[model samples]
Target: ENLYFQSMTLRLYSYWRSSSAWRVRLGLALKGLAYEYRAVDLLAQEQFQAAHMSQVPVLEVEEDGRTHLLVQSMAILEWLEERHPEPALLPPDLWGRARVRALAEHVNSGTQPMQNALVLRMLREKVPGWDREWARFFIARGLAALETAVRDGAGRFSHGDAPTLADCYLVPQLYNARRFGLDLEPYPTLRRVDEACAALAPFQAAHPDRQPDAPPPDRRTP
Candidate 1:
């Protein structure tokens, strides 16, 4: 019965391009939970497995001798926040929470789906003569709107001196922006907050490049 209420080891089945997964990773890092990372190879189409999506981020803990599996990024984040509650991800007040959610949704709901790797792959191979420039334009426009929101709401981080839901959402989107060479100069405020967050230990540890399954660095040891 003790194990039932106790925290468990988290196992994240994640892919590098999956921003949704990144959101949960950041939340776990912020909450200071130790977990096993189970990387899914999306480029190889591994996430289609019923075992993964059907049982994602599977939080395994002995509950009265039974193991429970929790799934979904957003659901996992809220659960962790509630269970841990030390460094709160959601703001205490309603208005502040709304602001954070607004920024989070901007990326999670709006911009990210459009620029997903699967969508981009289709845009390039399936669409008739897809112009890469148009793709860049759409991404740039979305980032610009995000830039304005951060400028309006930012304090040391996306929402304040410390990281919040806004920061969790923003970092992954910025990583995508850099991957595409999206001209970050047009989004100075976003860049500023991103730089600050990136320097942070939790943020750095949660970065895509830092994941264990990340491709090995190109080494030329003389």
Candidate 2:
């Protein structure tokens, strides 16, 4: 019998705006894993299907005789790390693993979830005062917290050497925050970490601008 890992091709269902998907894209690329990317048209409500657990960044795994779908961003990354560990995300040692996880959660679970695109939409359409206020409210607060975290973890990457799970999440969130016009000048640590990752090929390849559906840069009217 073929090993469960070797049985099938992996397909990543993602949305270009969904940085959660971008995290997986970056992680897979860094691990040197071969995967086919399936872009979801979220604006058309493509991710709400029950089959996908109503989410993008759902990793579809097909093995010798079966298929499995995993949803949620960070969870999928963890799963991938466990199943394929050559280019590991969490460190091999327990203490190092804990440290990397802490840094990743600072952005993944701590901040990004609070202001996800779907949540932002509800705030913009349903909740009053939250539309403009929340972006400023959460991003400023989140980035401030992230700044402190990055300062503490100050390494060439998030952990001191190679790019890990933490760097994957951190860099993308920086893009989102900066895109929202959240001035990042205040967070020198973020600036530095992002700069460090930008120099890496895996991270560069996973950038939103490099996505298959990324709008042409010149497509911007302004």
Candidate 3:
């Protein structure tokens, strides 16, 4: 689901394994924004627990004393950036910001959606064993494109020395890649960025394993 902000109040109704929701989680962490985490069962079709939930990703925002339900992960992140400008998710320069978005889109638009659970489930119903292959193939393909795109632009994180919106997308999508069993040796740039992101405390705090709804510590990664 989406991340909410109301008169500086913040909360997120999220599923632990949701990569889309994880994007907003990492964004909030990178910005040092604290939020109330509400976990939902996405598989049980319970993500729409909100009577007025708009698409699955819903964020409640309060403005002018009126409550506004916001949807879409990217829009929620942009809202956070504009509202809290100190620790920026976008770079200070115009070109850097543009490059960051382009890189972010490589994961957001080109890769992850191709192999999401919904898409994979549909593919599985259509063909017996095509789901995993579909996810693995597309995720590998996307990582190649991302690796090439960020070869020159990357420094520590996806953009430069600081974390950007691109890192928010990149981190979760990389996790998706691993889940699909995509061989990562091909993309050195992404691997390096992955290592860098892992070193950040905010990234670790927002990891899926650390989430409240994730499996118990002993059962994780099994």
Candidate 4:
């Protein structure tokens, strides 16, 4: 098992506005991992560089005279889960874990891909004349479905009283929703969960506003 030992140095490539990156930061914080923050400016196309493969949320881990570059948010999360199993992000039971995974995928697969930077850019340049509404349309549908999931399955967080993998995915998606002016009022369960996550230090510290590349407080987009 190529795992992250205590001697490893973990570095994360991230952008302040990227929700996928936000999820990694949240999971890392929850695990109490100390890592260097490398800011990649998505607007400047920094992710297209040779090292990054045009993707945000790349995690580089250096240890035992070797280096590993991990790409994609969900994969990074799973790696962390495997390497650092303490303070587990998944539920103990099979059924609970399945439910949590479903909730997470509801956002990760169902919501995030459609409204990411690449898709949004396509909407602007390829589709023409469409603006934020293009993003809002897809995001709202996902959030509505998510709200239904949460209403039926949630406790203090997405799946339970404690933060799990689902919370890591859910909070960031909600952050993106707020960015596009998608109101949270319609999803009372999601809104409640967001507030609960917001009150915690791990979640608060992982906020977009707290990132190294984030704009000044007053100037930040969200």
Candidate 5:
């Protein structure tokens, strides 16, 4: 065991359906970091840790004799990159890193937030007649821009032959895209990358349907 990693422990505060949590799940999967999967059912009013940074997906890092809680999926993923650099989630080159970061951000900031459950819940409560179309348009807009960015250079994954942070961010957002009824046919590049990710073991492991708290397929609809 590496001296730096032997004593560290990770616990993820996650929800099965949360897209943000899905990103971290993917990163943790690809990095080979074993962690405790702590499911948070915020909608059902399960207790939420008030110390979290923003919303969901808080990574509780127990390292160096202290518990370091990481807030936000992006930051948590960054910490993973630093702690476990073997898989190289970002990229070797600066330009490639920039491209992957932008691609990841498209889903992280541009797309996923628009259709987030919390955000939509706020809209439905505050706005008298908020429409689902609102989410559909924004999600499509973000994906369209991303498709153009990697249109020419994409390989088996988002940036190259290996899966990167871009793919980690994309696969989850695409799941949300399907949930929101935004057809994937328009973003062929993204869909291709998604298919590549789907074939991998880690991606399958982190899928929402496979999570401990995920409802059974035959369960009554919510």
Candidate 6:
């Protein structure tokens, strides 16, 4: 009795550099789901179309021969968790699931939006003398707190030995943090989890640099 209809195919609207979009891609790849990749040019305001006044990572699920457009990266990830459920992104036990969700939300809710492009633009346009430092300040604090939270419980991933929603969120955040020149040496736990996840097939496949629309090799950042 799931909410989803049968005979579905997914189309993911994404941008190569979007961390939020990267989260959805991670979830899809981890679940071994195939999807059509539709590149949305955020820099050119493609997301503000008349009917799509929102962000990237818009997943359109075609079910029962009908198309459904879904917004929000976290919601899309949860939808996949519910519909797929094998090799679960959430832990099997109640307490462990809560722990995983807590860690996932810490990055998904707290860290992502604070340093998103929209927020960065707001700071630059609205605040005087604002610079990338504004985003760096918030991301640095968030990563510090996240490191402390996961230091004790983390193994190869944020929750345990397996990849969960937390890693999906963490890897992308780490990528963004580096773009802002945030040194990750302060967060060894995060670094470890990131390295482990990056070695896995699913995470490796979802790397921003490997995407279809990724910029040329010379123009891309390391």
Those runs of model 4 whose alpha carbons end farther than 4 Å from true positions after fitting are 1-4, 46-53, 127-129, 217-222
lDDT by residue for model 4 (132-162), tens: 7887888889989888987786889888888
What is residue 36's positional error in candidate 6, in angstroms? 0.6
Tens digits of lDDT, candidate 2, 1-222: 235456567999987767889999988989988888788877556335423524788999887668789888789899889788878778878888887888788777778877876677678668775755676668778778878876875678877778889888888888778667787889898788889999988887888778777767786321
lDDT of 1 at 148: 86
Q: Please name the candidate that would achieve the greatest lDDT relative to the true structure.
A: 4
TM-score for candidate 6: 0.90
Q: Output the better candidate (1/6) by TM-score.
A: 6
Q: For model 2, what is the error of residue 25's alpha carbon versus the real structure, in angstroms, after optimal superposition?
A: 0.5
Hey, what RMSD does candidate 5 come out at? 3.7
User: 38-92 in candidate 3: lDDT tens per residue?
Assistant: 7766755633443332254456665555666666788888887888876999988
Q: How high is the lDDT of residue 206 in model 4? A: 95
TM-score sort, best first = 4, 6, 5, 3, 2, 1
Candidate 1 lDDT over 122-202, as tens digits, reads: 787666646355556767877888888888868888887889988888888887776666778888888889889888899
The reply for model 5, stretches above 4 Å from the true place, is 1-5, 46-54, 126-129, 218-222
The local lDDT score (0 to 100) that residue 41 gets in candidate 6 is 73
Clashing pairs in 4: none
What lDDT does the true structure give each of the candidates? 0.74, 0.79, 0.81, 0.85, 0.84, 0.84
Residue 13, candidate 2: how far off, in angstroms? 0.5
lDDT of candidate 5 at residue 132, scale 0 to 100: 64
**Ranking 3 against 5 by TM-score, winner:** 5
Winning candidate number (TM-score): 4
Q: Which stretches of candidate 6 lie over 4 Å from their true place?
A: 1-6, 46-54, 127-129, 220-222
